[model samples]
Target: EQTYYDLVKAFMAEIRQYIRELNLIIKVFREPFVSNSKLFSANDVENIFSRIVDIHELSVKLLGHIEDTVEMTDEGSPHPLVGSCFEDLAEELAFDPYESYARDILRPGFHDRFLSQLSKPGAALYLQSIGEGFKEAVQYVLPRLLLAPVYHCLHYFELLKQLEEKSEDQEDKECLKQAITALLNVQSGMEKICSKSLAKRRLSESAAIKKMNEIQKNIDGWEGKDIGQCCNEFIMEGTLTRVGAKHERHIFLFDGLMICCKSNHGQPRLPGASNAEYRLKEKFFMRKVQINDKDDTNEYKHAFEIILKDENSVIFSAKSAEEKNNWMAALISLQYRSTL
Candidate 1:
């Protein structure tokens, strides 16, 4: 029989070996094109790239599971190669967050030059006539190669180790869990922020009018952009300058990701800042003004709202909501969301 600790070591060894094997397999892809050019066809490179994503995903899944199950948290001590899988993954992906589908992928040059001598005005169409394989290669491979890397996550092994240890200690558990949850929340929130801040998800003119109308079910609407600025000024005035006219209690609402501490209570604050605080609450709903993004599809939409559960941590979801609190040896799940 093997102890859990021994199993963890063995698992770590296997994870390392598995990644090594994946690298080996990728080498078999052997795109001699870099050297021979004749031996490696576009098909060869495409196949190699496909295999690279597959192997990278597989290794990430395996290591994430192993880390979540065995290497729960950081020991605050250095463990070499602990987050090796994620590091590799960080390097493997080709999509840059800024490189949206609407981006100027058709741009030319070294920086963003997608069109090769092979991709001129009539060349793409000519490739389609060359062979089905050639067209298939152009359609999928060409588009992806033009895209840049996005949604980068370089997970520090230290982060996981910290979580595992924090889960055990009552004193630091909440702090660590909230911090981890903050990471997940930020990952989701950044997407919304990027889209909103960059106006990346702009609605069509007609759709925008319809959307404005749909939200006006309760009343009519007619406000200039300055109306928004004025409303903002008014709300800002209320939060910063209240009846007390004091800075003791500050409240604000922001439509973004907040990775900091909580209010008078030990909870998360607005998404605009990252800090730690101990919010003490003897009263109910004292001076409440929160910065939350409201949307049906937003995953961290509740993050901006006040927590109302018996336990502040539970309500605010500083940790894994399902566990509420880590019991002794709870298995953790790593969410590796796939996006095109």
Candidate 2:
């Protein structure tokens, strides 16, 4: 009885420490620093709030475990439910919280919003600073925040194991050992995301820097560009038709090439060996499409031709008269650039 009392007391103390750290993190994220602002600036506050809730929930569960353990009627033996708390922790750790965070919050939520904002003249400053802060959080603070609870639970499991021999319940002992393994796996999953995020940020930034430098080089040679006078446009989709086939494809222009592929949702192709994946097909080099242009006729209206370097012509038509002009303008710009 005395031994169980002391064990519960020790367990309470350790979980209390975890609560303290989690509370401090909540403070840093919630309470204003100077202005009491959280150091990290995320586009969506829900992401950080979701993470904080997860840790707080874990802490609450631990307190409940402590209370339940202390109240058990068994004098010298660990209660049947004594190890169940760790079981719940193991189950909770099975979910990777950051997967949705990375997909919804960081990728589409943050980067997409930030990039869209850049088109506006005033949107760059605050978002640029946020991007830097986020990079720092990615490399340093986030990993620590995520790992803390896992480490705490792991230690709790170890302490429970130390007292396991005092209890006659082999099943509960096995459950605790399994919980420990779960904690290890959770830690490993966290490390994998952190590494992937860091690598992605580094590679993305490097590529952006190279591409932007190339664009700026061209900008200088374009002979006094729009500077700050260009109109803003929002494009939903560009619709085009393949000549002779009477089939439609959504076209998107890239810097190096124009790709034509079937829309996945529209395709009815079965799972056969010859089924084409929704990927690169019918590629035309931007530079090559310009020089081999034979004649662009307005007679059919919404029709254009790209004569290949080998003298083979693949013709296309726009879905509408407006789209025809759009396609013509795109081809003209590419042809003009090849001349420069």
Candidate 3:
């Protein structure tokens, strides 16, 4: 039994190369959309999304294969590739294609050619609908694919550690421990630096220091895209008729507009239903509606109504009175903030 060391060396060599390849693929996957969020043409969206799906499928299969491989060992165990696995994958894909692009190939100008047309309200709304489509389509697969590399590394680490424990000789044991330490250190450094940098940003912002900049020119104003906190709520819209208004679970998302939609695993619903996208920028009034009159049980005592400026209104209920008040306050904040 050469043990996992034999596989460890093989895994390290194979996976690290794939990790480099993975990084390139990730950049390639993220680039066209990330650099310019609104620039993707229909074909462009199809091209990248398909590519990502292909990669995601590949990762999913590969993850299962790794699991199978580790289980084949004398002592069967799963890889420790769980929490914060996305970072591991990103780290593996460290290569940037900056040296090769034709200088202007990826410029912000190329992006503008696609996005400039979105200035029209119709076009902007159309693109937003497209964004929602992409969101739904890629909802399950993309994130897992992104973090696949992390799990891949954990497979290597876990199997190798198992092999280390099984070994008897001091020489083999020392070597294995060194390899484990190196892997652990890399992850530790990666996490520590990342946490520190992120911590610094929030801390500095909270400290309220004078800024050398005022909301940078590039950031401009609210781009009418989604912003702020989002949560899931059990909702009942429209009038409570004699037939009855049933409670439907929904995701309450605060985009540039506060919108509600049926929860797809607690994600903001796409703009499919009439009540799915609510524009909070428009003048709206919210008031608590007592539910005891509607129901003898008073099960929905914390019901409420959002009366829009257009006179159209929607009814909703929350799990608690505090939840009802919080949702109302959130909408009010969006309404007030929309003015500025």
Candidate 4:
């Protein structure tokens, strides 16, 4: 029981540290020395730092509630009411600010340029001269600070889990369980949005465009629709074998189509040769396709069937169960988006 209380105290200390760092970040951004650099606009600072300020205020209140509960309780007693604090936080913590920061600031070339500009000799010297509370350099702290909200959510989830396990009272257990569920829901919702946004960002990059052109060139007798122009959004690409085929095929999944290509193995080619690595076997419009999976079998351990509209269904074997699930998830998300 003493150990549990000690852990809670430590967690509270960490929250204090988090708030301190958040304050330092806000101060640094507001400084004329830093702001005059023009690395980030005043509006960018408001968008990102304003949310941090909100979180800092919330943490201050949370610390007050926790201190009150801990002081009121006698030694060797579980703090049942502390669970309510986390439950409130789970509902209040908004990941939307971070999501916007990621989608707008980091996804594009701005964040990179921001870092590069800060790292210049003159900027670095100026940042280092900003004395107290900046023991850890701004470059290192700023990036981690941006992710502090998600990290706090994860930390609370872990600490609550430990507290829940150690609690002796039935009521305490029930309270902690509710708090855990709320945090779990918030964490998962944030995860889904983060990944979908990242995937959308990936499809728009120069690398993805180059990959589309390469795939277009590699496919033999490519026709009907242009790979780069028609299906612009790249989803995933990997090697998978057909259920009854002898050779493995490389599959490219896009937002609106799936392309299957036969790999050209054992053919000697020079470096940087214009030879195609894979020949197009077939292509299926994503809107006209359906995916189905089954439990592992002796012959096909990790396989999924793709049922095409107006054509016979075909089964493809993934390298592993995880790969199969990834493919399934990508397809399912695409289908879900189309429906909306």
Which candidate number has the best TM-score? 4
True-structure lDDT of candidate 3? 0.39
The residue-by-residue lDDT of candidate 3 on 1-340, one tens digit each, is: 6554465546646665565556544554354355554565555453333334344444554455555545564543333222122223334432111111212222224324433443434544443454432321122223223334434443555765775686555555565565565466545543343245433342232122111121111121223322321212212222221113443533323223333322223345457532312222221223322111122354555555454555655556666644544454344333333221
Write the residue-wise lDDT of candidate 2 on 121-214 in tens digits.
4333433344323322322233234345545543554566665545457776676667666666555544454356643553232222343233
Better of 1 and 4 by lDDT: 4
**Candidate 4 residues 92-187, lDDT tens each?**
643234444344433345446555656655665555566532322344334444555555644665788987787676766777787777566555
Candidate 2 weakest lDDT stretch, 10 residues: 227-236
lDDT of residue 47 for candidate 1: 31
Q: Global lDDT for candidate 1? A: 0.32
Least accurate 10 contiguous residues by lDDT in model 4: 132-141
lDDT comparing candidate 4 with the true structure: 0.63
Tens digits of per-residue lDDT for model 1, 16-61: 7556544433442222223335534565454323334444555567
Off by more than 4 A, model 3: 1-31, 34-132, 137-145, 167-175, 190-244, 247-340
Candidate 1: minimum summed lDDT over ten consecutive residues — where?
328-337
- Name the lDDT of candidate 2: 0.48
Candidate 2 matches the true fold with a TM-score of 0.35
- Candidate 2 runs further than 4 Å off: 1-8, 31-50, 76-81, 92-147, 153-167, 181-184, 191-340
Scored by lDDT, the top model is 4
Clashes of each: 24, 4, 2, 0
Error in Å for residue 65 of model 1: 4.9
